[PDB]
Amino acid sequence: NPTLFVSYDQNGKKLSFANWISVLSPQDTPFVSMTGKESINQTIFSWQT
Amino acid sequence: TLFVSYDQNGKKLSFANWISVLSPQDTPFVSMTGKESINQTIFSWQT
Amino acid sequence: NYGRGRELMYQLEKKGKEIKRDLEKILLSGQARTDVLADQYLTNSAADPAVAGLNDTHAARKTGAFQFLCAHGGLAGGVVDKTKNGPADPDTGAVTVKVAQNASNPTTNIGFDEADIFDMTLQLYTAGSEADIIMINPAHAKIFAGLQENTQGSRKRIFENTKQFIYEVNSITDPLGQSYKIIVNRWMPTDAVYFFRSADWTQMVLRAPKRTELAKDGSYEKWMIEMEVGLRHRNPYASGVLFTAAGK
Amino acid sequence: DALASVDGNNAHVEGSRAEDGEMKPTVIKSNVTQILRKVVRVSNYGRGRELMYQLEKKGKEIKRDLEKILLSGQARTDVLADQYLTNSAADPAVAGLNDTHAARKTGAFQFLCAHGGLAGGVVDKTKNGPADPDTGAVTVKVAQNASNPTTNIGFDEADIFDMTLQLYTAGSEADIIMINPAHAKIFAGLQENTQGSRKRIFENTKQFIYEVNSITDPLGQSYKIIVNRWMPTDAVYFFRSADWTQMVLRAPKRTELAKKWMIEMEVGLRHRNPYASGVLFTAAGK
Amino acid sequence: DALASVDGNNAHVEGSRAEDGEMKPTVIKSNVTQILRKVVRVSDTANTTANYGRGRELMYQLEKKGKEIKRDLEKILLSGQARTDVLADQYLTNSAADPA
Amino acid sequence: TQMVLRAPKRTELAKDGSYEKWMIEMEVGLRHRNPYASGVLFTAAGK
């Protein structure tokens, strides 16, 4: 339509989304993630105070 | 926790201009003779 | 899609992050222990009493946190009472958990008084824990900073033509020669502080984080994450905690 | 929008029997772009060619206007609110008359920073923002200067540290703070006090440095301060480089109308996440 | 979209171009892309049993069902159907149509 | 032209007490261009 270019009636638009998702969430685990493991078999363990 | 990562769908695509055309392109004179152009606004011929 | 990649791997990573956050909160919280096994013939006679024979519900399953008394005073039913001073260890005599009052400060400024830290350190010293670490949540570090501000003039800062200003404190030295470092965690009850110890106090996992799934009923994309971690302390009278001043 | 909550207890009894999950997927946010004209109209000691001079002057003026607007409290207002597409209707009564022109208004800074209201077209400067479901954090709060009996309009000594705490809880990682020169005196005097716990020293020094350009909350978050005269006096901002981006559609073009000189710059504002940046209004409660 | 309305007369003036038209997002909505379904629930004794003409009943019924779904698809594309799904596309300014 | 979503494929879902289930899950769709481009002619005895 070379006569006049109009914008409000523009059909078949392109939403122009963003290829990224800000998933910011607090998850640091400073020390508790760096303690270790003592894998066991049962679920009734103890430590003999 | 709870990573699914199946619903991104960040397509963000635009239109493609798939419109239809109905243009007849016979052009008999332009194809056979060529180009001819008058200069004045009025033209006459004798018979 | 336009911003999403897939509906399974994305959701799977989501659930993994969520399960890690859940574990982090559960370990450092008031997750009272609730078990049904009142075993009496233990100590090298491992058996389940006649009860719990054929039934397969087994609802109650929890651990840790006071109920898991952890050297606390007392809890009110299914909720941990953050108002009960701990017992006295007969070894030397020391309470590792107490509740200071908010009378030295206004009746609306919930927090410590700069003297409870040293009291806790002395209690630990008498108990012989040798703890040197602090896990505290926000809204209480400002106390660690302004301990040298809410005074009469005795303590004071200095700024020698320096454009920087600082209210950060990540270490203190007890008068007993015990150095303590501060580390901020956000999964706390925002009303207490933990004088926990180093990695010596470790946890143990029975079923590591692993995926399973059922095949199909008519149609679905089911998945599972069923880690079975558990916690463990060591000589509960060693470490200690300090609740904040609320009143009663 | 956010990650899923913690939910606290997650014990189980050897059985899933789920409810199709509680995903509750993200929310889709958008923004609009506006237009700036700054027309030029020409109808001689040293100026000579005044055209280029006035053109550069108007360019600087439009840049200043952009810097003033993007930091205002405007709120995007247009016929479309959440159904921006409406490809079916899309203002059907537009073609044929072409005189239904509405005014494109873009979203401002204070509108995208997790606001809690707006006075029609401006953000309300007396109402704190809501809380994000991920972790309880109020990134927009009404300042409360508990030092004076509501007489002086100034930041409290511990009102920016509250913002730092909230951001750390929400995980913004911002490290910049813009401020109007009508408030730098506050941070300048903050290095001193009357109780006697904070005081400068001069050990045979021929200098009187009275300035602050760095802060570190007890949480260990550094914050660099910068001054900008194009901000509203009754507000302070907590910026961050990557969290804010400037979207542009039409670059500044020097041209003329249909068959004078003029400029036309289509620009819009984008913000990665509302609960990342922080704003704080300065006033007394009433 | 629209192409033209009328041809008529082409005489024009230097100012007879006031205005004509309006603007509203396109009315092309969507296609729902219906789905098909064919299943069997053969047992084990059935798959193990034998019979004349065919072998494992399971594969026989599975192939029959494949042919049947092919026929069903071929027939559906020719019958009279109209889409009325509740997932109205409605893009474009109030896009993504997720208020329901 | 058609609008196959992923594909026509056969696969089994979770079984039962000596059952055996299978599914196809074929998903397609049509696509006409210029609705005013294909002819239709019904047959009627009258109106």
Residue numbers in the entry:
A (entry chain G): 3 to 51
B (entry chain D): 5 to 51
C (entry chain G): 102 to 349
D (entry chain C): 52 to 94, 102 to 317, 323 to 349
E (entry chain E): 52 to 151
F (entry chain E): 303 to 349
Question: What do the authors say?
Answer:
Escherichia coli phage SU10 belongs to the genus Kuravirus from the class Caudoviricetes of phages with short non-contractile tails. Here we show that the virion of SU10 has a prolate head, containing genome and ejection proteins, and a tail, which is formed of portal, adaptor, nozzle, and tail needle proteins and decorated with long and short fibers. In contrast to other short-tailed phages, the tails of Kuraviruses elongate upon cell attachment. After binding to the host, SU10 tail, nozzle proteins, and short fibers re-arrange to form a nozzle that extends the tail.
The capsid is closed on both ends with caps formed by the major capsid proteins organized with local T = 4 quasi-icosahedral symmetry. The portal complex of SU10 is embedded in the capsid at one of its fivefold vertices, where it replaces a pentamer of capsid proteins. All hexamer-hexamer and hexamer-pentamer interfaces in the caps are arched (145°), however, the hexamers that form the tubular part of the capsid are connected by two types of interfaces, arched (145°) and more planar (160°).
